Amino acid sequence: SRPILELKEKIQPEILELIKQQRLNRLVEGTCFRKLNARRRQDKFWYCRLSPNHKVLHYGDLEESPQGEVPHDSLQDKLPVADIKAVVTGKDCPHMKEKGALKQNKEVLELAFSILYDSNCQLNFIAPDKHEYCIWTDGLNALLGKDMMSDLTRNDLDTLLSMEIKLRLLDLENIQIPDAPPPIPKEPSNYDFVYDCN
Amino acid sequence: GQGFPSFLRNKIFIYRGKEYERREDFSLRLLTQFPNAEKMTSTTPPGEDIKSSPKQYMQCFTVKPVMSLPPSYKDKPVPEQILNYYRANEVQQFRYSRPFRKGEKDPDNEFATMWIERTTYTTAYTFPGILKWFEVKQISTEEISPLENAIETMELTNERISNCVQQHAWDRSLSVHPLSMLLSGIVDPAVMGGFSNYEKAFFTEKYLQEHPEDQEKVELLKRLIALQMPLLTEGIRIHGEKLTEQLKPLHERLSSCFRELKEKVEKHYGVITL
Amino acid sequence: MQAIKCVVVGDGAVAKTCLLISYTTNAFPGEYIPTVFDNYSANVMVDGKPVNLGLWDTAGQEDYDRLRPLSYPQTDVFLICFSLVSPASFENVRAKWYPEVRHHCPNTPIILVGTKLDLRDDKDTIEKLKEKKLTPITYPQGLAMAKEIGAVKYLECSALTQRGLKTVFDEAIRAVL
């Protein structure tokens, strides 16, 4: 499958952009995200909806809505997508290093993500589980315009690339691809097509 | 810009924002309305390059709702409520003051250079309307001399004091903190003494060399502060009516400085009271 | 409907009045028109309901320490102020402003606020401070001072940019709320 593998991974980007566009859709539909230490009458659930334009984020201390995202003007309808330095994931979150009242336990080490903005403000949030944590980081990095960080993302890449290529080898069925490509027959220099064009 | 729609490119509109739109909140809302959300910084003048360039450029700022003309209301001692309604509604004129430095930037003083290039805006229709916004119809600039600015500042201060005095004179269960607010701020121009600032700016004979024929305005300043002092008197008496023990040192300071300024204007400024 | 008392002090070399008047005017940045009188007021909603507001513009030099505290009584919040780019302001506040403020009103929600937030990273200003042997003091030690008081908040803003300035005042109002 050496010619097959070359031809397969060589036409990569379409699945990549499809994955990322889906991630953007997932961010837009969003969910009621999770806050820090929302124990005493603090709304742990709260939606963070990406703009359909994907430039602003509708988020804030929204209520405990089990249905999820509600379309309206959230507590803060802006997150500046043009200046976010990064998102800190895991131990890099300072709130994980908190040793006082906001001690995020070791059971949320993989659920910690904070948006870097204003160079002094952070958005220390929690994910309900790993897969959506990685999904949100994926969507953010897509806004950041870089690679993805979900195991499920690699899963999707491999499975769908295999599906597409497996569909393509139907014309060459019972035929083989010489890993050394066939030599190009020489083209006569004249372009005087005796029969008409088109 | 040019990417704006046909009726939007190189256009200017006036928006009837919400009751408490801080400027940048409304700016954020407008950016939500648009891609290419970049904000210009030469707020007053347009950009000729951008009068044709793509990449839609915008700019937003609050403007002053110029008072309407309540008909058959010009002199009758009508209560405020109808006027406060007329402050914002049924309006078509809108102005915006333009700070400008004109003259020497001497350190202790700025009122030697202030020249306001106010910008009056007239739109075809009258807020409120079918649309929460409207395109400006005619644009007009203005020019204001430091004498003039001193004037307008002075009266608008006077009417503000009158307004607070009357609004508290009709309702008794009313906070006295605004009275402290004003009475303090006027009594001690602590950060910079506005009165002496007028004196150096215009009352000095130097200005009467820059403005010999234009001394018919410094006398207007004199008459306007002259009408100010009795308003300060009603302010002092109103405070005394609403005075408390914490305000007692405050009130005595106000009263002492008030009669000080009284004698000063009568003789030191030489202005004749009524 | 209601109003809130809120005092502001600080050394006169920072022109806090410029910030206050720019905010109340809602003007363009760097386009405020300075009046002649102090003690500004405004009427803003922060959450739920709009509130009236009154800002005590207090002169900051040492002499008026006899008249300034008489306005302190029954002030809902006070806003202590400085210049982020003035180590001398830090000396004055940690040494004079903050101590006497805590003395006069040991019972008041307090927020420390920076100023010239842009000039904290102004390279020419920073090099001037270095050649004048002053420090363009950064956030973390300001945070340390805030913890030293344990103020209900500490923020940094600028007048030429008004950044966080609305956040400053919303935090100030919600301090009572």
Short mmCIF file of N, CA, C and O in Angstrom, two decimals, chain A residues 4 8-9 15 27 58 61 71 74 86 95 100 103 112 124 130 143 148 151 159 162 169-170 193 195:
data_model
loop_
_atom_site.label_atom_id
_atom_site.label_comp_id
_atom_site.label_asym_id
_atom_site.label_seq_id
_atom_site.Cartn_x
_atom_site.Cartn_y
_atom_site.Cartn_z
N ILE A 4 -0.40 3.53 -2.35
CA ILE A 4 -1.71 3.83 -1.77
C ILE A 4 -1.56 4.78 -0.59
O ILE A 4 -2.28 5.77 -0.48
N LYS A 8 -2.79 8.56 -0.23
CA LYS A 8 -3.81 8.75 0.79
C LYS A 8 -3.46 9.91 1.71
O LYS A 8 -4.19 10.91 1.77
N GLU A 9 -2.35 9.80 2.43
CA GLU A 9 -1.96 10.92 3.29
C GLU A 9 -1.54 12.15 2.49
O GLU A 9 -1.52 13.25 3.06
N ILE A 15 -10.22 16.54 4.82
CA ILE A 15 -10.74 16.00 6.07
C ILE A 15 -10.36 16.90 7.23
O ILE A 15 -11.12 17.07 8.18
N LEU A 27 -18.52 24.29 18.96
CA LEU A 27 -18.37 25.45 19.83
C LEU A 27 -19.60 26.35 19.75
O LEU A 27 -20.09 26.83 20.78
N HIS A 58 -20.69 34.28 23.72
CA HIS A 58 -21.76 34.64 24.65
C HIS A 58 -21.65 33.71 25.85
O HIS A 58 -21.93 32.51 25.75
N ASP A 61 -22.09 33.88 33.99
CA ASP A 61 -22.66 33.06 35.06
C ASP A 61 -24.14 32.83 34.77
O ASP A 61 -25.03 33.41 35.39
N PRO A 71 -30.28 31.00 23.81
CA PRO A 71 -29.89 32.12 22.95
C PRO A 71 -30.39 33.45 23.50
O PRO A 71 -31.59 33.74 23.46
N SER A 74 -25.69 36.99 26.92
CA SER A 74 -25.16 36.41 28.15
C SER A 74 -24.59 37.51 29.04
O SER A 74 -24.67 38.71 28.74
N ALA A 86 -3.31 32.28 24.54
CA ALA A 86 -3.44 30.83 24.51
C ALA A 86 -4.51 30.37 25.48
O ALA A 86 -5.23 31.19 26.06
N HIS A 95 -5.03 28.32 38.67
CA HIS A 95 -6.07 27.95 39.62
C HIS A 95 -5.96 26.49 40.06
O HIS A 95 -6.46 26.12 41.13
N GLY A 100 -5.77 27.42 48.44
CA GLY A 100 -6.64 27.99 49.44
C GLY A 100 -8.08 27.52 49.36
O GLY A 100 -8.38 26.35 49.65
N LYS A 103 -9.13 25.41 45.64
CA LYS A 103 -8.28 24.25 45.37
C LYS A 103 -9.03 23.30 44.45
O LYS A 103 -9.83 22.49 44.90
N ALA A 112 -9.15 21.29 33.29
CA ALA A 112 -8.80 22.68 33.56
C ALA A 112 -8.37 23.36 32.27
O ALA A 112 -7.46 22.88 31.58
N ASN A 124 -11.04 30.55 34.00
CA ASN A 124 -10.72 29.25 34.56
C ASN A 124 -11.98 28.40 34.58
O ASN A 124 -12.85 28.58 35.43
N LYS A 130 -13.56 14.31 29.48
CA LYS A 130 -12.36 14.51 28.67
C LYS A 130 -12.70 14.86 27.23
O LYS A 130 -12.07 15.75 26.64
N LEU A 143 -9.62 28.37 16.16
CA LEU A 143 -9.57 29.83 16.19
C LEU A 143 -8.13 30.31 16.23
O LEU A 143 -7.77 31.28 15.56
N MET A 148 -4.98 19.98 16.25
CA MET A 148 -6.04 19.54 17.15
C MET A 148 -5.43 18.71 18.26
O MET A 148 -4.33 18.16 18.13
N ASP A 151 -7.81 12.85 21.10
CA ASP A 151 -7.63 11.49 20.61
C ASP A 151 -8.75 11.12 19.65
O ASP A 151 -8.51 10.46 18.62
N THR A 159 -10.12 7.22 10.52
CA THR A 159 -11.24 6.43 10.04
C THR A 159 -11.82 7.02 8.76
O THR A 159 -12.03 6.29 7.79
N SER A 162 -9.52 6.67 5.77
CA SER A 162 -9.61 5.30 5.28
C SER A 162 -10.89 5.10 4.47
O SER A 162 -10.87 4.44 3.42
N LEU A 169 -10.19 3.39 -4.64
CA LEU A 169 -9.51 2.26 -5.24
C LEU A 169 -10.43 1.36 -6.04
O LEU A 169 -10.01 0.27 -6.45
N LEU A 170 -11.67 1.77 -6.29
CA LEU A 170 -12.61 0.92 -7.00
C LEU A 170 -12.30 0.88 -8.49
O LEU A 170 -12.44 -0.16 -9.14
N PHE A 193 -3.96 20.04 -32.60
CA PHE A 193 -4.95 18.97 -32.44
C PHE A 193 -5.74 18.84 -33.74
O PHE A 193 -6.49 19.75 -34.11
N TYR A 195 -8.27 16.91 -34.61
CA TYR A 195 -9.67 17.06 -34.27
C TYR A 195 -9.85 18.24 -33.32
O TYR A 195 -8.91 18.67 -32.65
#
